Amino acid sequence: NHEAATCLEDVVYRGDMLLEKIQSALADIAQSQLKTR
Amino acid sequence: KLISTMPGIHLSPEQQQQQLQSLREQVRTKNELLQKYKSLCMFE
């Protein structure tokens, strides 16, 4: 049950670094279409 | 000549000269956003 917390949190971190990248990959084109107007 | 009116001063020729650059800038900024979307490596 200790390692299940570690095995769960590691794929959580894989979600964490992936979501932080693609939300920025959302963001960089998100404000990009603002200045297109 | 009336047939040749719908090419002419409907949009002024000087204004045509200005909006030629507007269309060229539209094409260029469309291309610019296209290679800005394609160029960045969003993957780590």
From Swiss-Prot, chain A:
It comes from the Eukaryota. It is found in: Nucleus. Belongs to the Mediator complex subunit 21 family. Interacts with PPARG. Component of the Mediator complex, which is composed of MED1, MED4, MED6, MED7, MED8, MED9, MED10, MED11, MED12, MED13, MED13L, MED14, MED15, MED16, MED17, MED18, MED19, MED20, MED21, MED22, MED23, MED24, MED25, MED26, MED27, MED29, MED30, MED31, CCNC, CDK8 and CDC2L6/CDK11. The MED12, MED13, CCNC and CDK8 subunits form a distinct module termed the CDK8 module. Mediator containing the CDK8 module is less active than Mediator lacking this module in supporting transcriptional activation. Component of the Mediator complex, a coactivator involved in the regulated transcription of nearly all RNA polymerase II-dependent genes. Mediator functions as a bridge to convey information from gene-specific regulatory proteins to the basal RNA polymerase II transcription machinery. Mediator is recruited to promoters by direct interactions with regulatory proteins and serves as a scaffold for the assembly of a functional preinitiation complex with RNA polymerase II and the general transcription factors. This is Mediator of RNA polymerase II transcription subunit 21. It comes from Homo sapiens. The gene is MED21. The chain holds residues 97 to 133 of 144 of the full protein.
UniProtKB/Swiss-Prot annotation, chain B:
Transmembrane segments: none annotated. Signal peptide: none annotated. It is found in: Nucleus. Residues 14-41 form a coiled coil. It comes from the Eukaryota. The modification Phosphoserine is found at S12. Belongs to the Mediator complex subunit 9 family. Component of the Mediator complex, a coactivator involved in the regulated transcription of nearly all RNA polymerase II-dependent genes. Mediator functions as a bridge to convey information from gene-specific regulatory proteins to the basal RNA polymerase II transcription machinery. Mediator is recruited to promoters by direct interactions with regulatory proteins and serves as a scaffold for the assembly of a functional preinitiation complex with RNA polymerase II and the general transcription factors. Component of the Mediator complex, which is composed of MED1, MED4, MED6, MED7, MED8, MED9, MED10, MED11, MED12, MED13, MED13L, MED14, MED15, MED16, MED17, MED18, MED19, MED20, MED21, MED22, MED23, MED24, MED25, MED26, MED27, MED29, MED30, MED31, CCNC, CDK8 and CDC2L6/CDK11. The MED12, MED13, CCNC and CDK8 subunits form a distinct module termed the CDK8 module. Mediator containing the CDK8 module is less active than Mediator lacking this module in supporting transcriptional activation. This is Mediator of RNA polymerase II transcription subunit 9. It comes from Homo sapiens (Human). The gene is MED9. The chain holds residues 99 to 142 of 146 of the full protein.
